[PDB]
Amino acid sequence: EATWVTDKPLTLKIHMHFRDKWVWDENWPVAKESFRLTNVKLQSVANKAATNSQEQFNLMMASGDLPDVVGGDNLKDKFIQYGQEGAFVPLNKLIDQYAPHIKAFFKSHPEVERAIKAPDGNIYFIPYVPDGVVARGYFIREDWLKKLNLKPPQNIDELYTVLKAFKEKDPNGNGKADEVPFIDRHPDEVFRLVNFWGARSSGSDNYMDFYIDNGRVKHPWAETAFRDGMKHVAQWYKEGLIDKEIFTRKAKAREQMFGGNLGGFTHDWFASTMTFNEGLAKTVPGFKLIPIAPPTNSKGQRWEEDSRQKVRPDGWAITVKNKNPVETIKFFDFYFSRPGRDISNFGVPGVTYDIKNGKAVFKDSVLKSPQPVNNQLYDMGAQIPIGFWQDYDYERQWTTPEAQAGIDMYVKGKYVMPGFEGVNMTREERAIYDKYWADVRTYMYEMGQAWVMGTKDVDKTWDEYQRQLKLRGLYQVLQMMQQAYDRQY
Ligand SMILES: O=C(O)C1=C[C@H](O)[C@H](O)[C@H](O[C@H]2[C@H](O)[C@H](O)[C@H](O[C@H]3[C@H](O)[C@H](O)[C@H](O)O[C@@H]3C(=O)O)O[C@@H]2C(=O)O)O1
Numbered sequence: 472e473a474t475w476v477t478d479k480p481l482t483l484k485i486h487m488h489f490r491d492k493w494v495w496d497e498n499w500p501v502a503k504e505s506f507r508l509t510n511v512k513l514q515s516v517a518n519k520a521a522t523n524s525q526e527q528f529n530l531m532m533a534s535g536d537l538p539d540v541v542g543g544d545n546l547k548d549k550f551i552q553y554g555q556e557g558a559f560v561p562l563n564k565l566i567d568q569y570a571p572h573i574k575a576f577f578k579s580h581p582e583v584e585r586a587i588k589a590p591d592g593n594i595y596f597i598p599y600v601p602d603g604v605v606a607r608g609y610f611i612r613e614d615w616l617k618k619l620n621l622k623p624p625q626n627i628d629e630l631y632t633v634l635k636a637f638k639e640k641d642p643n644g645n646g647k648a649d650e651v652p653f654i655d656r657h658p659d660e661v662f663r664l665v666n667f668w669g670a671r672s673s674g675s676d677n678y679m680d681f682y683i684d685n686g687r688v689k690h691p692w693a694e695t696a697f698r699d700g701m702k703h704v705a706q707w708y709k710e711g712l713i714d715k716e717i718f719t720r721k722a723k724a725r726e727q728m729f730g731g732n733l734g735g736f737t738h739d740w741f742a743s744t745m746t747f748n749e750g751l752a753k754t755v756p757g758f759k760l761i762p763i764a765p766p767t768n769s770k771g772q773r774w775e776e777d778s779r780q781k782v783r784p785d786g787w788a789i790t791v792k793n794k795n796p797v798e799t800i801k802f803f804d805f806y807f808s809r810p811g812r813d814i815s816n817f818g819v820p821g822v823t824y825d826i827k828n829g830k831a832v833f834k835d836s837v838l839k840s841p842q843p844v845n846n847q848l849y850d851m852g853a854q855i856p857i858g859f860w861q862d863y864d865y866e867r868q869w870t871t872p873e874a875q876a877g878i879d880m881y882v883k884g885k886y887v888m889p890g891f892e893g894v895n896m897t898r899e900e901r902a903i904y905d906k907y908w909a910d911v912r913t914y915m916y917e918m919g920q921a922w923v924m925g926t927k928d929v930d931k932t933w934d935e936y937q938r939q940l941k942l943r944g945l946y947q948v949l950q951m952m953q954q955a956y957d958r959q960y
């Protein structure tokens with residue numbers, strides 16, 4: 472083909488483990504199409520049965536028989552760290568000489584290129600570049616509001632009242648107290664509930680991210696506002712307003728809790744969450760989620776903390792052991808070209824989409840399925856966190872008119888907080904970040920889970936928490952980031 476990057480079929484070994492559940496699959500329809508178009512085939516050497524993607528990365532890197540390519544989600548920091556240590560090769564020259572689509576992309580998106588570079592100036596991975604503006608929003612069961620003769624909640628006091636009514640007043644009508652007012656497929660969203668009491672939970676679409684407040688680098692989970700917000704979240708969990716299994720239900724929470732007519736309220740992405748309106752029309756009579764503006768928080772503001780990232784901390788890299796770096800960067804380049812963006816965004820021609828008027832258009836069966844289109848695509852190897860350039864037109868096609876009115880409402884309302892994009896640390900500053908931040912984050916999450924589940928009291932353990940943050944190096948990390956901030960700005 473005209474899109475081939477090599478004349479002889481080339482097989483590369485990839486270690487890709489993502490979202491704690493999935494691996495590259497050469498027998499994916501999209502992987503087969505990838506091979507057809509590029510003449511490069513990726514063979515997985517990852518453990519399909521393993522259940523923690525970050526631990527699989529760590530194991531593989533420690534094991535001495537490195538693959539040719541490493542890919543996955545939440546690997547930016549490790550791509551940079553181990554790139555500098557020489558396990559991943561710098562891509563700057565390879566891109567300049569052999570990857571015209573990536574080169575053009577970075578030229579038009581210099582902020583993205585700057586955001587993925589290591590302190591030594593090297594590019595150690597090609598990223599997942601999202602396309603879009605908003606990410607999550609709030610959704611509530613309008614049919615339950617109607618049955619209970621309640622209005623959509625305008626503020627946090629009204630939200631509490633409405634969730635309490637969902638809990639206590641049997642809106643699914645079975646005479647059982649089985650309603651679970653707040654559910655979420657991302658456990659981390661339980662902490663984002665602190666927004667309703669004027670506390671940040673994150674500076675970005677990455678959970679538990681740093682943020683900038685009045686020229687100061689802060690971590691949201693270290694602030695007293697977070698302490699006070701978490702007291703409210705713990706009380707909601709105690710009262711059963713939050714899914715008891717919020718920390719373990721995970722990916723199919725909507726299918727289980729909306730499909731089972733148990734859930735009343737969530738914070739999740741506009742396109743896929745609103746698909747459940749048509750998806751459940753048959754099996755759950757009357758089901759209707761509506762987007763609502765964030766209920767006014769305790770400080771008088773409507774917050775949407777989440778936003779679409781300019782670039783995600785995901786993608787793939789070329790290892791030092793890869794004997795075909797030129798073919799590999801050309802293969803990478805395919806996913807920033809139109810033919811490669813088609814399959815990585817839309818799937819396989821004649822299976823999920825067709826070219827019509829020169830553009831990829833999803834088939835009717837795809838657009839009508841109760842399964843959200845991005846889930847359909849995951850199952851065949853598209854919309855996966857390789858290095859690729861996402862195309863928002865894929866998403867437009869299954870964004871319902873009602874979902875779009877929600878998006879436009881959030882844009883017009885200016886609810887969406889601008890995200891933290893990072894600071895430009897030196898090698899020595901980032902080394903402190905590398906030393907401490909993962910340990911701190913793990914400690915934070917464990918404490919937060921205990922607070923939510925009520926096994927630790929927030930007020931009674933806050934001093935210990937702060938002592939721990941200090942001896943685990945959080946404030947050293949903040950110091951380093953503040954230094955980088957002060958130079959930058
Ligand atoms: O659901 C949508 O409407 C939607 C539209 C966009 O086109 C993307 O497909 C978007 O994908 C999201 C997805 O909804 C999840 O939020 C996912 O979260 C994963 C995180 O990216 C990290 O990988 C985390 O460690 O795991 C999360 C997970 O496993 O769910 O992120 C994708 C994405 O950003 O592409 O959804």
Ligand SMILES: [Ca+2]
Pocket residue numbers: 641642643644645646647648649650
């Ligand atoms: Ca009930």
